Design a binder for this molecule. Structure first.
Ligand SMILES: C=C(/N=C/c1c(COP(=O)(O)O)cnc(C)c1O)C(=O)O
Ligand SMILES: C=C(/N=C/c1c(COP(=O)(O)O)cnc(C)c1O)C(=O)O
Ligand SMILES: C=C(/N=C/c1c(COP(=O)(O)O)cnc(C)c1O)C(=O)O
Ligand SMILES: C=C(/N=C/c1c(COP(=O)(O)O)cnc(C)c1O)C(=O)O
Lengths: 387, 388, 387, 387
């Protein structure tokens, strides 16, 4: 037998210390490693290039995604940066989703303005938009599913096959669901990447990124570029992220229980005009999400009746949703993306992506369902009091 | 509403930084804190006495246990040490369980031999033994329930009310269930203590202890003695412990699911002579555990058929049970207490406790139930193969 | 050759990782260590008993002090507590100095009141007071030299041979000079202990203690008691402490240069009644300090002219001396012991020690001498403007 | 009065904690920061963009270099990467030294093959080579002085002034000497950058980078690019780096004492054909180094008589020089750059740089001079025994 993915995450680096037989893996902060006498480099020589603590996390995420190996970067934006430098040169074309993370948008646009590559932004959910983008022979197609923050679902099998047919590489940003809820490489993707800052770490105390390649040769290119650009992460951050990873399965059971209870409260509630949550049969992408995901996750957004005055009364008084950026932590978060997560975009790359200004996004934590539901009811009720 | 235990643990550090509004609490490593000009101590002056990162952990554990406050120590034994120094003096008698952690037994015996207090070692599950011990007007009674490593259950209401009748204080070692699954202060205990090393931290990468007192004045005496003896913990360890605390609920759901499945495999298996697990209806104390606990936990022990040869074959080959000391980690562990956790005890204190030389203890992790059961069945075949 | 103290501190734990040859030693946070199959304990089993990261610090402090081994505790008071528990029992007498750290006084008095041992507090600088204390056949004598906060020197050779004549063990609190500047075991002490919180760590970001025994058997007993009472320290703290240790020599060079300059400013300044600093030729014990120490260190205290108003004006406005407890940090500190470090003493135990209510203690850091002298001169003017 | 640079390094973040008055600054690991109610972003919102612990280090290095601000990256290579992205686009040309760090060479040459900018590789110590490079209207000139590993000195005033006359920006890599021994912005440079991995950290347990801009507007561009590319560093690493910085002055006093004693042993010793150390009057660049540096540092390389067999007998037996990459730590290191630090280059971008195969580089630590001298003497004897 191999073990399950939950067993492998819990046991990553457990009882793998040759020095002392430590159960928990030691933190190797060391910048440098001795040679074994003249001309004899050990497995490791310099932490920017390779570090064993970082490589445990690399190997664990590669085993979870079904990849040949993993590279750990200082940030999730760094992992995207690494893929752009490893794969694209000027004259190559990149296809990206129209509703990708605002930070992804900012980076694609600033590097396209300089001429590092040509950029096509398409709606990958619309066959016409996709086939128009693939007709232009792109080197690389980026998929982000589900999308942040309207939870649009992209058909992995479909887009990946359409991209193979024209000779394009595919990279999927799998941050929103993590490896425990979606395995893009199962559907033939070349590359999967994460902001480990979110669910993989789970404790809102590490900014980090990962890239896992299906193929050994593309993994070796990512290792080379990560070292040459200096994008590699801190061993201390890898140590906390690996510790975080050990509870990813346990955490997501509670996240998903809470999210199912909260989607049921928000959907058809008098003060809520629209819920974006792939778990609702009415959500465009529900059946796709039910098929290509092991679960519907714990990210959702919703449009509150009553414009800005209603949002303000909803938000001001929350005891258990902290008004902050980021997502995927044990603690429940709320955000208003126009102003907050999506402020990097122009006011009509925002309207083109369909991100309103009366929209709230919830990152549902692992608190008691009943406490979060009391917290949301009190807010809905403060929003009602403003009509 | 106040919130649930799960919410309290999850939200323990959160949005509590006045400097920057950091969601996750900053690590205050600082040994010292400035005065606010001449003669003006701030809230904190010196980390041995008081540290804000350590106090977030003390507060969270006090809220979970229902106490007035918490003191965080460098180890679980140090928490026991703190209580013995704050409460006892020469001429006092301490009652302890016969079947307590071997490390507990080692400290009780070493300090009694010096004359710090008189020691009575009683079976607090037998009303006769309890009543003989309380007859001698003890200053303090220590309860450890469930007991390590035979999972004997002591009746908190019964023992605590009998101890109060003779004006004894009570302290409960709640390590094996954590505050999420047993609240001894709800039964009238003066003190609850923990090795945070186990379930509260959950990641096997901190040694630590905690003591929560029901009453503010006793809490203040523990603060004083912890400061004076220098038993307080590292701010960094309290950071990691608080981080682990946040997943206590989510971890215990999987631990208990896995332990229910493994108990079902071992109970009545032909290769298993006895299983000790409070969740089994045939376990002495089952009905007690169901009423005083919110769950049956994920510690259990069992005795194989086939003596030492069966034990050796079972253990050598386990893929998902690391042979090691400790418990309460996300990673599954197996111990042989005779030769490991209880080796500090004499052969006769072990015989008196009923810790046999064929006893195996499981700390059941949060790996996939399907994998833990495959690993155990293959161990059980390895043991069976040794009967011929 | 074996190497010097400076080489030993710098190189503690360097190239000592068998797993990867990391130059800097890995942090073994692990609570537990696997057995090597049934019945086979490895070197380590459980971090409370024994941890390799903690033991690198123990080993380094034992090499530096000349001892058989070292035990690392959670705090300095915990090292004192460990010694009291390992060595004494009821009916034993302990001799302590009259002018020890207030925290030591607090613990000695609290445990004597319970009856763990009988307590004699003696002036170990006065042969009369010493000989009256040793006439009573004590089990243990504690020496603290130089003393906190009046820098009284006790004659290690004198007090230790007198104690041995009556079969008493001796323990020296060597916190104020560190092993780099005084080696009490070279004078025949049984035990030396430290608050590592001070010069050994040097960065004010760890509370810790250490006890080094000359004799292997007494070391094994301290190991046993530290394990059994749970007084051992955190592996992470031991890592930071070892990192700090590596600059102990380089830091003391600057501390002592700065202290020599500040002593020359304060000694005979119109605003200064008394300076207590062993490097001054007029300090009782100067000649003793020059023979039993490798340097005069960087702790000093002094008494201003002008009573309380002068103290308040001097202290308000200091730019480079933080008013705070502790000492031995790279950052310069000022304390008023009456109301801070020695507030745990009775007004009468303080009077008996000659700790006045107008006494200021400097812990001199490694800032530029020129800046510390500018700051102190401006304080001395603020105090003068007050007469 | 401002304080000195040593005072400012020692006291960076000391007593600057509004929460508790902590002397030592608290580690802010948090990925995210709450809003102060709806629409009220605090100073910080997301660690990839800004983090107060990282900013203490930024601000400390900006104060030491005399710049408007500092950006802290995950690696030193990342700091160079950041500068290339913030300053250059296709069609811009970059001038770099011929003998720049091997990893710098690797990054410039890979990004130039893709067409991100045009590369001119010049000898900045030769007027003709420089004026030919500057005649091509370059956007950016990079200076690395002293050079790694032959310690070539480039004239900061001369190259910076010549680069301004043609409208070029200058960036200096000041890794080898640190801000305590060289301030390139004092001579009018636009940018100074470091691998904090080396002397600034000083304890071989952090890989990191820094960039300090003279001008506020160029600093704000580096902040924007560091966030967008995800090149920013971990707060834990910033915390250790800041702790390291506090002993930079104290450490370099001992480093420089030791390097002076070792240069005297090696220079004209029978087994040493050449020493490269700017402290020697015979070294090309000695007088320049005496003028533009506060000290000669503690990096040196040397050519051993007797080819590969001599190098091997020298290296195998060293007790106090660890055979390893990196430099700037408290612990003494030796490297053979052809095979080790400079293997990133082709065998004849190296002959062009003048890096031979009988060449050892020393990173001289802060151990006792006498232990290092005994160690080097014994190695010279083993090398002698091979003729
Ligand atoms: C900060 C957020 N997201 C980060 C993110 C990133 C960037 O990762 P870092 O923030 O770790 O650079 C990449 N991809 C996706 C889908 C992401 O959501 C947020 O939406 O609040
Ligand atoms: C090491 C073990 N137990 C520790 C322990 C302790 C002591 O805690 P520390 O190991 O954290 O000092 C206290 N109470 C109970 C019930 C315990 O089980 C064990 O049985 O594996
Ligand atoms: C807090 C101080 N000293 C502590 C100390 C201690 C106690 O160490 P900890 O604070 O690390 O427990 C022991 N011995 C001496 C001579 C000491 O000065 C001080 O005087 O500021
Ligand atoms: C690894 C080495 N140097 C790194 C370095 C770097 C790159 O820094 P990181 O290794 O921190 O990426 C940049 N600039 C200079 C002058 C450098 O020496 C070495 O020479 O061994």
């Amino acid at each position: 037998t191999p073990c399950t993915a939950a067993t492998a995450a819990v046991r990553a680096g457990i009882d793998r210390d040759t020095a002392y037989g430590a159960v928990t893996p030691p933190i190797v902060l060391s910048s440098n490693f001795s040679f074994d006498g003249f001309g004899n480099k050990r497995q490791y020589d310099y932490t920017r290039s390779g570090n064993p603590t970082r490589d445990l996390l690399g190997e664990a995420l590669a085993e979870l995604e079904g990849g040949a190996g993993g590279v750990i970067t200082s940030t999730g934006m760094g992992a995207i940066n690494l893929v752009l430098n490893a794969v694209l040169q000027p004259g190559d074309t990149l296809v990206v989703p129209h509703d990708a993370y605002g930070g992804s948008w900012r980076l694609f646009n600033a590097l396209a303005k300089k001429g590092h590559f040509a950029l096509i932004t398409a709606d990958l959910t619309v066959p016409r938009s996709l086939a128009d983008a693939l007709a232009q022979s792109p080197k690389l197609v980026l998929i982000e599913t589900p999308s942040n923050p309207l939870l649009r679902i992209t058909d992995l099998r479909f887009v990946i096959e359409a991209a193979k047919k024209v000779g394009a590489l595919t990279v999927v940003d799998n941050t929103f669901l993590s490896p425990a809820l979606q395995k893009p490489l199962d559907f033939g993707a070349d590359l999967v990447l994460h902001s480990t800052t979110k669910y993989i770490n789970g404790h809102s105390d590490v900014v980090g990124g990962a890239v896992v390649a299906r193929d050994a040769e593309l993994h070796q290119q990512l290792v080379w570029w990560a070292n040459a650009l200096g994008l590699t992460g801190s061993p201390f951050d890898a140590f906390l992220t690996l510790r975080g990873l050990r509870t990813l399965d346990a955490r997501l059971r509670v996240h998903q229980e809470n999210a199912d209870a909260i989607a049921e409260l928000l959907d058809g509630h008098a003060m809520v005009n629209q819920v974006y949550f792939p778990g609702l049969a009415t959500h465009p992408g529900h059946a796709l999400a039910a098929r290509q995901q092991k679960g519907f996750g714990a990210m959702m957004s919703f449009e509150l009746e009553g414009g800005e005055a209603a949002v303000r009364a909803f938000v001001d008084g929350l005891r258990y949703f902290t008004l902050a950026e980021s997502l995927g932590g044990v603690e429940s978060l709320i955000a208003h993306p126009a102003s907050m997560t999506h402020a990097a975009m122009t006011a009509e790359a925002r309207a083109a992506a369909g991100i309103s200004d009366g929209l709230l996004r919830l990152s549902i934590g692992i608190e008691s369902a009943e406490d979060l539901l009391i917290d949301l009811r009190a807010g809905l009720s403060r929003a009602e009091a403003t009509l």
